[PDB]
């Protein structure tokens, strides 16, 4: 579940795991396909699409989806989630505004995007009716068994985590998640790369002049614009899109 910089995250620009990129109000059926940077779906391991894994800390939190809310000018209706990606039936709206409820906090994310829903037809409704003729609209699927396209999803770059840079009672003290690769030095001269377990820092003292980094590329990410490049390489991780636009007859 990637974490990026939401633009108007309740107050202002936070870093939400559900940071909204690639809003697509381009279909007709009241539907938008969205990408959160969060990867809900199965858990970390193997079970139940209808659970909920975002990033809290450096860490995931693969738990229940209980109180998702996509919304716009009005509250939307979820359609389905798969991967980083959710489909939801929305009305028109100047913006798009997404958010779940972890339980202790609202913890939402919101974004600008021009949305409309013309139905296909010479009638310019604002909303799909219960009746009328069927005719060839453009629309996204409910399903996941989907390969019609795939987007590049290679590694994450590093990320900041100054929870690492503690103090060794006079020196600034870095640690490691699980033996992950922490890329480290300070403005002063000390250890210059950092590919280590928990190091200390001989030279500098201040937490605010050091490289708290997490090269933790055991799991790839979506290639968000709000991602810092993993400078090393274009790793593999070509990964499908579920919600292909299909020729449904709305």
């Amino acid at each position, epitope marked *: 579940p990637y974490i990026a910089d939401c633009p108007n995250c309740g107050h202002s620009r936070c870093d939400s795991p559900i940071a909204i990129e690639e809003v697509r109000g381009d279909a007709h059926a009241g539907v938008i396909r969205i990408q959160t940077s969060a990867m809900f779906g199965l858990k970390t391991d193997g079970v139940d699409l209808a659970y909920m894994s975002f990033m809290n800390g450096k860490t995931q939190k693969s738990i229940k989806i209980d109180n998702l809310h996509v919304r716009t000018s009005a509250p939307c209706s979820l359609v389905s989630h798969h991967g980083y990606y959710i489909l939801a039936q929305c009305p028109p709206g100047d913006t798009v505004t997404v958010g779940f409820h972890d339980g202790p906090n609202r913890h939402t994310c919101t974004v600008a995007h021009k949305v409309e829903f013309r139905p296909v037809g010479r009638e310019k409704y604002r909303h799909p009716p219960e009746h009328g003729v069927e005719l060839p609209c453009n629309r996204y699927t409910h399903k996941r068994a989907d390969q019609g396209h795939y987007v590049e999803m290679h590694q994450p770059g590093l990320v900041a985590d100054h929870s690492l840079l*503690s103090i060794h*009672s006079a020196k600034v003290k870095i640690t490691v998640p699980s033996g992950a690769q922490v890329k480290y030095y300070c403005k002063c001269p000390d250890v210059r790369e950092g590919i280590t377990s928990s190091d200390h820092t001989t030279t500098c003292t201040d937490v605010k002049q050091c490289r708290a980094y997490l090269i933790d590329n055991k799991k790839w990410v979506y290639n968000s614009g709000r991602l810092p490049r993993g400078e090393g390489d274009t790793f593999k991780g070509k990964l499908h899109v579920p919600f292909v636009p299909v020729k449904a007859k709305c």
Partner: antibody, heavy 117, light 110 residues
Framework: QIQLVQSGREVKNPGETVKISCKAS????????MLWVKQAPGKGFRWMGL????????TYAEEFKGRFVFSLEISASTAYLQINNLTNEDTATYFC??????????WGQGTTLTVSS | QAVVTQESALTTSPGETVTLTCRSN?????????ANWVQEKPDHFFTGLIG???NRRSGVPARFSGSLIGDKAALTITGAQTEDEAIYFC?????????FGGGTKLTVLG
């Protein structure tokens, strides 16, 4: 197991230079850098700096940046302290030390310098 | 630019429990100061006891343990012995350099 054995004690008149060796035994030199500590006659213990026995970069304590120069005969597991333009108030004992376990675990025997005409 | 302070001298008897402390002039001592305890026996004989607050060097009797008590680093000798009579120095890390305390002269009956 680990022995850091130091050179013997010198006498030097003011102005001279001294190279104090520290020959390491028992560990792999390269994974543990060296602390140089000055225990001055009265004053107690003071950190002079640390040398990365892997890259070779020294850190000096600010009190020691200048006349003091750390170096190493890597090849022979030796670290060395060189004090140039000896000042009379440098008489004291200098210890090499291994930095490990979030501190220092082994200290050497000491090399005592008596700066005196 | 930090001053480590230690008790000057402490006297105990064989079999007792004695605590030496290490205080930092800048603030409470914390685990990021990686308190080290070093012992000096006569003849300029140095050995490391504890490092990173509570890691006992290998081959240092178990009667020796380190910890943080209040806002300072402490060394406890549980069952002090006659052999423990020496000077104990604490060292604290401060992001880029080490500062040594003045040392505590400990005297043990025996």
């Amino acid at each position: 197991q680990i022995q850091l054995v130091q050179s013997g004690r010198e006498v030097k008149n003011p102005g001279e230079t001294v190279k104090i060796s520290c020959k390491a035994s028992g560990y792999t030199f390269t994974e543990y850098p060296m602390l140089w500590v000055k225990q001055a006659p009265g004053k107690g213990f003071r950190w002079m700096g640390l040398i990365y026995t892997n890259t070779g970069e020294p850190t000096y304590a600010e009190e020691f940046k200048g006349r003091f120069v750390f170096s190493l005969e890597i090849s022979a597991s030796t670290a060395y302290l060189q004090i140039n333009n000896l000042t009379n108030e440098d008489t004291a004992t200098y210890f090499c030390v291994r930095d490990y376990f979030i501190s220092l675990d082994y200290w050497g025997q000491g090399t005592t310098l008596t700066v005196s005409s | 630019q930090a001053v480590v302070t230690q008790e000057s001298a402490l006297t105990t008897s064989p079999g007792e429990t004695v605590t030496l402390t290490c205080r930092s002039n800048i603030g409470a001592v914390t685990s990021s100061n990686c308190a080290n305890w070093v012992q000096e026996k006569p003849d300029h004989f140095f050995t490391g006891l504890i490092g990173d607050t509570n890691n006992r060097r290998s081959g240092v009797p178990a009667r020796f343990s380190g910890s943080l008590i209040g806002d300072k680093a402490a060394l406890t000798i549980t069952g002090a012995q006659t052999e423990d009579e020496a000077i104990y120095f604490c060292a604290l890390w401060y992001n880029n350099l080490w500062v040594f305390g003045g040392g505590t002269k400990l005297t043990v009956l025996g």
